[PDB]
Structure formats: structure tokens, C-alpha cells
Amino acid sequence: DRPRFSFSIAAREGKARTGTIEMKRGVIRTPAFMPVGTAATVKAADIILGNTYHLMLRPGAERIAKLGGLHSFMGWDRPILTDSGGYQVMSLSTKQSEEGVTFKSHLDGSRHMLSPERSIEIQHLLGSDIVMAFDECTPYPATPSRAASSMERSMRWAKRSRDAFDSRKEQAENAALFGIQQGSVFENLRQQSADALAEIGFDGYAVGGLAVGEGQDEMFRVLDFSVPMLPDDKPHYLMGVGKPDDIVGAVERGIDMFDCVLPTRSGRNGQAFTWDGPINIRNARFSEDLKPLDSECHCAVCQKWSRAYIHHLIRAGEILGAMLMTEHNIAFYQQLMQKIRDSISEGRFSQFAQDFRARYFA
Amino acid sequence: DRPRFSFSIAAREGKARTGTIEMKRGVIRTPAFMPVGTAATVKAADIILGNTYHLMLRPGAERIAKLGGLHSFMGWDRPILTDSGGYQVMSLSTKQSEEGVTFKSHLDGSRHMLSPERSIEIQHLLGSDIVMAFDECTPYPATPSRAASSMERSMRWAKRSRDAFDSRKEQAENAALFGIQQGSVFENLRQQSADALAEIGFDGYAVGGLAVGEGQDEMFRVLDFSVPMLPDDKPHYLMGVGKPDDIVGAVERGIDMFDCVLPTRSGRNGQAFTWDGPINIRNARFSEDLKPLDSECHCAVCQKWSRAYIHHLIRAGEILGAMLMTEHNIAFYQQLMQKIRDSISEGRFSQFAQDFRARYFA
Numbered sequence: 001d002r003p004r005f006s007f008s009i010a011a012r013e014g015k016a017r018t019g020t021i022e023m024k025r026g027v028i029r030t031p032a033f034m035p036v037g038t039a040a041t042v043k044a045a046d047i048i049l050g051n052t053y054h055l056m057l058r059p060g061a062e063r064i065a066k067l068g069g070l071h072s073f074m075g076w077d078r079p080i081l082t083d084s085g086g087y088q089v090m091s092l093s094t095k096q097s098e099e100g101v102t103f104k105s106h107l108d109g110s111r112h113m114l115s116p117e118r119s120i121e122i123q124h125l126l127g128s129d130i131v132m133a134f135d136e137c138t139p140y141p142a143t144p145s146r147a148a149s150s151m152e153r154s155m156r157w158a159k160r161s162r163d164a165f166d167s168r169k170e171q172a173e174n175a176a177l178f179g180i181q182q183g184s185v186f187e188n189l190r191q192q193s194a195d196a197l198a199e200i201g202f203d204g205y206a207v208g209g210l211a212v213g214e215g216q217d218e219m220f221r222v223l224d225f226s227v228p229m230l231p232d233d234k235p236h237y238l239m240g241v242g243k244p245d246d247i248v249g250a251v252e253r254g255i256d257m258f259d260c261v262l263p264t265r266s267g268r269n270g271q272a273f274t275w276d277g278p279i280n281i282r283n284a285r286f287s288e289d290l291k292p293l294d295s296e297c298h299c300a301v302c303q304k305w306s307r308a309y310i311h312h313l314i315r316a317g318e319i320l321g322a323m324l325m326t327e328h329n330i331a332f333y334q335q336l337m338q339k340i341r342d343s344i345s346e347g348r349f350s351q352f353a354q355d356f357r358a359r360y361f362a
Numbered sequence: 363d364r365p366r367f368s369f370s371i372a373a374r375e376g377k378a379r380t381g382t383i384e385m386k387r388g389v390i391r392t393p394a395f396m397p398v399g400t401a402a403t404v405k406a407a408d409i410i411l412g413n414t415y416h417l418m419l420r421p422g423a424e425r426i427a428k429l430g431g432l433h434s435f436m437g438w439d440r441p442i443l444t445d446s447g448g449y450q451v452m453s454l455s456t457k458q459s460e461e462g463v464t465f466k467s468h469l470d471g472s473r474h475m476l477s478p479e480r481s482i483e484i485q486h487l488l489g490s491d492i493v494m495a496f497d498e499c500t501p502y503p504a505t506p507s508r509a510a511s512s513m514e515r516s517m518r519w520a521k522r523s524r525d526a527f528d529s530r531k532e533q534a535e536n537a538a539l540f541g542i543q544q545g546s547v548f549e550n551l552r553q554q555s556a557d558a559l560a561e562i563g564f565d566g567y568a569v570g571g572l573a574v575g576e577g578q579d580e581m582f583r584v585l586d587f588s589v590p591m592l593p594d595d596k597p598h599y600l601m602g603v604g605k606p607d608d609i610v611g612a613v614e615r616g617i618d619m620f621d622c623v624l625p626t627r628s629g630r631n632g633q634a635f636t637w638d639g640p641i642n643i644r645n646a647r648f649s650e651d652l653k654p655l656d657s658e659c660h661c662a663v664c665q666k667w668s669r670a671y672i673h674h675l676i677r678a679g680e681i682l683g684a685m686l687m688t689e690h691n692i693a694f695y696q697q698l699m700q701k702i703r704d705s706i707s708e709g710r711f712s713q714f715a716q717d718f719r720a721r722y723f724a
């Protein structure tokens with residue numbers, strides 16, 4: 001019988017690590033990509049995401065619980081990770097206070113408060129296995145004073161999240177809780193945030209406040225000093241990242257877990273990922289191209305259909321085209337993660353990262 | 363090795379028949395439903411449709427031929443049926459003459475003529491296995507004089523279609539040609555059309571000019587006298603039909619083959635077919651319904667996911683929801699055809715039709 005949570009590092013190369021998270025509902029191989037569950041039929045990825053913000057508004061967390069929780073609802077018996085919901089409230093919905101955030105639903109005008117306690121309860125009702133602390137994703141750019149005030153509030157909210165999670169027996173005994181580091185681009189604030197989170201104690205640690213407009217060079221610079229501040233023996237989750245090259249560089253800097261809307265968003269908009277870079281399949285140059293989306297990809301789409309046919313479907317308005325693109329993109333991301341894990345385990349990740357970049361950007 | 367074309371009737375009940383069409387690329391069990399190939403990944407339906415009108419405009423028949431034909435393009439090695447293209451020209455695009463029809467492409471302004479000879483050549487370039495004669499689908503309603511003039515032109519075009527098909531060796535030796543009966547709702551014109559088509563000689567015979575606004579009672583009345591006029595020993599294809607109850611009643615009247623945009627169109631618009639009638643899954647009454655789309659359906663969607671989850675996906679704007687609906691609808695139609703074939707073979711089709719209607723309309 002698997003434990004509630006156990007992270008083991010099997011191999012390392014530089015700052016990169018590969019290993020496993022064991023949870024009751026399954027094993028997660030790291031570095032891991034965690035896809036959205038609703039964009040395609042995901043098969044046994046090791047873990048999928050639930051969209052807390054959307055689920056709060058439709059059909060509501062209480063209703064999801066009445067339906068048996070997300071595992072039953074989505075037909076997925078393996079681990080599920082949910083965010084704390086505030087990122088999207090600030091992004092898509094507001095009135096803020098030390099208690100939390102209040103906002104109105106665009107779907108029907110209903111009122112909603114979101115606090116550390118309510119966010120944890122929502123994630124409990126959804127039934128997720130990895131629960132995120134309720135934080136504030138500081139806007140970018142931010143002055144040092146505003147970044148500090150924001151981070152300090154997030155650390156108070158992290159303690160309230162910890163206490164709310166520990167108060168619910170089923171959650172404390174069966175799920176895991178991750179804390180989220182903030183501090184914008186400032187090394188001293190990132191250090192204070194890491195120290196506060198480690199003092200509270202979490203099962204895993206996320207790097208928050210990135211992928212919010214800063215650009216890859218700046219993101220990598222912040223990761224260079226921020227990831228070593230987190231406990232080495234716990235998983236590191238970079239929220240909102242990212243493109244394939246973002247993932248490779250973040251793994252080089254010690255990140256273990258990733259989520260990004262790109263593969264599913266790109267698939268609905270004609271963009272396919274390949275080892276030679278992204279392609280927009282709607283372009284006329286693909287109308288007679290008999291090659292698969294990617295020449296090495298092992299996914300079911302690339303085994304059967306050509307670029308020309310997928311181009312045709314999308315140009316004809318057939319949803320089948322976008323579905324095949326999305327299935328290929330999710331599979332490409334998982335093949336990327338498998339190559340990353342194998343190369344770290346084999347001591348050739350540095351070479352893989354170099355070869356990957358030379359071809360992806362050629 | 364299978365013949366170019368051979369239709370065998372295995373069992374009969376009243377006017378209903380069940381049997382097989384053997385062609386080089388496979389066997390087709392009848393009565394058959396023939397789905398669009400582009401709306402979902404169709405698995406070995408016995409035959410799928412190519413959309414001649416769309417393919418003529420994008421990417422063009424010559425280009426499809428350059429890509430290897432529709433079988434290679436779509437990844438489908440079994441039979442394909444194509445229409446002659448004029449129905450949609452009159453429906454979606456015109457200048458008519460005894461030579462054919464000319465029209466302009468809305469996609470790019472290019473000019474296109476469509477004649478019996480060009481329609482047959484287009485279907486040859488597409489590589490389809492069952493080729494339809496180039497006809498005129500008479501508008502409804504039509505006066506007797508206009509229905510007669512229209513039908514007479516279609517019969518001249520049927521002879522030109524026959525001759526064009528026979529002139530192309532690869533087509534004549536490997537494909538089959540169906541003639542299309544016209545005559546609107548008029549028994550004497552339907553008889554003249556059937557006589558003309560049988561004198562020319564075709565591999566199968568379609569009932570054209572229906573599902574164009576006349577309503578089920580009138581359609582059934584026309585089928586009552588029109589189907590017995592066609593050769594009994596050849597397949598009968600009712601073009602454009604239809605809803606599940608249309609199919610059952612048409613089989614009762616001697617039809618062997620069906621095509622309809624409903625299951626794929628309905629699936630993209632929130633309508634699912636069930637043995638208790640169609641349901642619109644977007645309705646709020648399905649938001650907490652844990653039953654599958656249909657309680658008896660054996661499709662992969664109904665084995666795994668609830669009405670509540672499919673409702674959620676569609677309401678959230680996820681294309682996955684429409685894809686699952688479409689896959690269920692195609693599977694439902696094939697389960698309907700299997701029940702029809704089994705019941706005719708077993709001598710219980712009359713009872714099946716009665717039980718089907720009582721429950722579908724309850």
C-alpha cells in the first residue's frame with residue numbers, strides 16, 4: 001500500500017533530478033508534466049489538473065462533491081492536482097483584504113469569497129490529491145515594497161492554508177499540501193518566502209509569481225537563485241510553465257513538476273509542437289505535406305494521419321482536427337518528459353538539453 | 363478475392379431486406395448507415411462518405427489525387443461513397459444548362475463547371491468505391507411539369523454518367539455506379555425514372571429528391587410506391603435520410619442504405635440520440651445526471667462518462683464534449699443498424715419497429 005506522500009530522488013545531473021512521488025492513488029514520475037483533464041481523454045500522464053476556478057463557478061464545488069468528487073466525475077482514478085483559485089480570480093474575474101478576495105461571477109452574478117480556509121475547503125470538496133496553498137500571485141513588474149507586502153500576505157495565507165488543511169481529517173490523511181514561494185524577481189524576498197514556507201512545512205514547494213510576463217531570460221535568472229532556497233528533498237513545482245524550451249531550462253535549474261495551457265490551447269488554435277519547433281498547421285505549406293505532425297512522435301495521430309489531412313480538417317472547420325492536434329501535443333509533451341527523465345537517469349541530460357535546443361531553434 | 367460488386371439478400375421480412383454488398387475493399391452489411399469520415403475517427407462502419415462538394419473546393423480533386431486519393435488521405439482502407447456534387451452546389455453555392463451547372467467558389471472566387479462527365483472524373487480522382495450519377499435534386503414543392511422536365515434532364519445526365527464511368531478503365535473495373543431516381547412526389551414520374559435507370563443499368567439505385575422539406579408522412583407515402591419500382595436484386599439507397607425513426611420506416615419500405623448529417627451535426631450542437639428519443643445535453647436537467655448518455659449503449663463514451671460530465675464539458679466550451687457526443691451518436695446509429703439487421707434476419711423486425719417507436723416517442 002502506497003503512502004499518503006513520499007518523494008524519492010533516483011538520479012541527479014547538476015541541479016536536475018529525476019524520481020518518483022508515491023501517493024495513494026498512484027506514482028508520479030518526475031520531472032512531470034501535468035495536463036488539463038478536460039481538453040482530451042487523458043490515459044494513464046501520471047497526474048492531471050482540475051481547474052478550481054472554473055469548477056467553483058460551474059457547477060460549484062458542493063455540486064462536484066454531490067456527484068462523487070472529481071475522480072468519479074472525470075473518470076480518472078489517479079492523482080489530481082488543483083490550484084487554490086485566486087490566480088484566475090485576479091486574472092479573469094474583485095475586492096481584496098487580509099481575509100481573502102471577494103468577486104462576482106460573470107456566469108450568473110452570484111457572490112463568491114475566496115480565503116485560505118474556503119480555498120482549502122473547495123479543494124477538499126473537489127477531492128484533489130495535491131492541494132495548493134492559497135496565495136497572491138504578485139503582478140509583474142512590482143516594486144520591492146509591493147512585492148514584499150504581497151509576499152508577506154501570501155506567507156500569512158500559507159499558514160492559514162496549512163491549518164485549514166490539517167483540520168479536515170480525510171484531507172490531512174489522504175491528500176498533500178504544497179506551499180507557494182513568492183517574492184517577484186527579488187532574491188532577498190524569495191529567500192524570506194522560502195524560509196517562511198519551510199518553517200510551516202509542506203509536502204512540496206511551488207515557485208509562484210513567474211510566467212506572468214517577465215520573459216525567459218528573467219525567469220531563468222530568478223530560478224537560478226530561487227530553487228536552491230527550497231528544501232532539496234521535496235518536489236519543486238514551477239507554476240504556469242511552459243513552452244518546451246522553458247521546461248528544459250527549468251529542469252536544468254531543479255524543477256520537478258510543470259503545468260501549462262500551451263499544448264491544449266495551441267491544439268485548439270492550429271499550433272503543433274515538434275522537435276523542430278512549433279508549426280501552424282493551417283498554413284498553406286502543409287496542404288500537401290504527407291509527413292506526420294512530427295517524424296519521431298509515437299502518438300496515435302502520428303502513426304496514422306498526415307499533416308495534410310490534419311490541415312484539411314482544421315481548415316474545413318472540423319473539430320476532429322483540433323482534437324487530433326491536442327492529442328498529439330499532449331503526447332509530445334509526455335515524450336519530452338520521458339526523454340528528460342531517461343537522460344537525467346543516464347547522465348546525458350546536459351547533452352540532451354544542448355541537442356534539443358540546437359534542433360528546436362534551428 | 364472479392365468481386366468489384368455483388369449484392370446478396372440473406373433474409374427478408376415484408377419489404378425489409380438484410381444482406382451484404384461485397385466490393386474489393388470490403389463487405390458492407392445492409393441495411394447500412396454510412397457516416398461522414400471527417401467528423402470523428404471512424405473505425406472498421408463498413409463504408410464512409412467523402413464530401414465531394416467540399417473536396418472539389420478544398421483542396422480540389424486533382425490535389426486529392428496527387429496526395430494518393432481519399433483512402434490514403436483519410437487513412438481508411440475500406441469502401442468510400444461519394445455524391446455527385448450538384449446537390450450542394452444548388453444548396454450552398456449558379457447557372458444551369460443541359461451541359462451542367464457553373465458556379466463560383468466562395469472560398470476564393472475560382473470558377474467551376476459541374477457536368478456528368480466532370481462529376482464522374484472528380485469522383486475518380488477522389489478514388490471512391492461507390493460513385494453517384496450526376497443528377498438534379500428537384501426542389502420541393504414542384505409542379506408536375508417542372509418535376510417531369512427536371513427528372514427527364516436527370517435521366518439524360520444518368521446516361522452521360524454511365525458512359526463517362528465506363529470510359530475510365532480503373533473506375534469501371536474497381537468501382538461501382540449508382541443511378542438516382544427522381545420525379546418529386548409523383549408516382550408516374552417515379553415510374554418513368556425507374557424505367558429509364560433500369561434500361562441504362564446501374565450497380566445500385568438511389569431514391570433521390572426526398573428529405574428536402576416534405577415531412578415524414580409524405581416521404582413514406584412516396585417510398586411506398588417508389589421503392590418497388592427499382593430492381594429488387596440491387597441495393598436501394600435513400601439519400602439524405604435521416605432521423606432514427608425515418609431509418610426504421612424506410613427499412614420497412616425496402617431501403618438498404620442511409621446517409622444523414624444528423625448524428626454528426628447534432629453532436630456538435632448538444633443533441634444526443636438515445637432509445638428514449640433525442641436529448642439536449644446542455645439542458646440544466648443533465649447537470650447532476652450520473653447515467654450515461656444512453657442506458658443500453660455499448661459505445662466507449664457510455665462505458666466511461668456520465669451525462670453530467672459531458673454536459674459540463676460542452677457548457678465549459680471544451681471541444682472534447684462535442685467529440686464525445688459525436689462518437690456516441692455515430693455508435694448509436696450503428697447499434698440501431700445492427701438491431702435492424704438482426705431483427706430482419708430473425709423474423710422479428712415488425713415487432714422491433716413497433717417496440718422502437720413506442721419507446722422512442724414515449
Ligand SMILES: CNc1nc2cc3c(=O)[nH]c(N)nc3c(CC[C@H]3O[C@@H](OC)[C@H](OC)[C@@H]3OC)c2[nH]1
Pocket residue numbers: 036049050051052081082083084085086087088132135136137138180207208209210211212239240241259261
Ligand atoms: C500562466 N502563468 C501562470 N503563472 C502562475 C503563477 C501562479 C502563482 O503564483 N500562484 C498560483 N496559485 N497559481 C499560479 C498560476 C495558475 C496555475 C493554474 O492555471 C490553471 O490553468 C489556467 C491550471 O489549472 C488548470 C493551474 O493550476 C494547477 C500561474 N499561471
Ligand SMILES: CNc1nc2cc3c(=O)[nH]c(N)nc3c(CC[C@H]3O[C@@H](OC)[C@H](OC)[C@@H]3OC)c2[nH]1
Pocket residue numbers: 398411412413414443444445446447448449450494497498499500542569570571572573574601602603621623
Ligand atoms: C439532406 N437531404 C438530402 N436530400 C438529398 C437528395 C439528393 C438527391 O436527390 N441527389 C443527390 N445527388 N444528392 C442528394 C442529397 C445529398 C447527399 C449528400 O449530402 C452530403 O452531406 C451534406 C453527403 O455526403 C457527405 C451525401 O453524399 C453521400 C440529399 N440530401
Ligand SMILES: [Zn+2]
Pocket residue numbers: 293294297298299300301302303328329331332
Ligand atoms: Zn504525434
Ligand SMILES: [Zn+2]
Pocket residue numbers: 655656659660661662663664665690691693694
Ligand atoms: Zn454511447
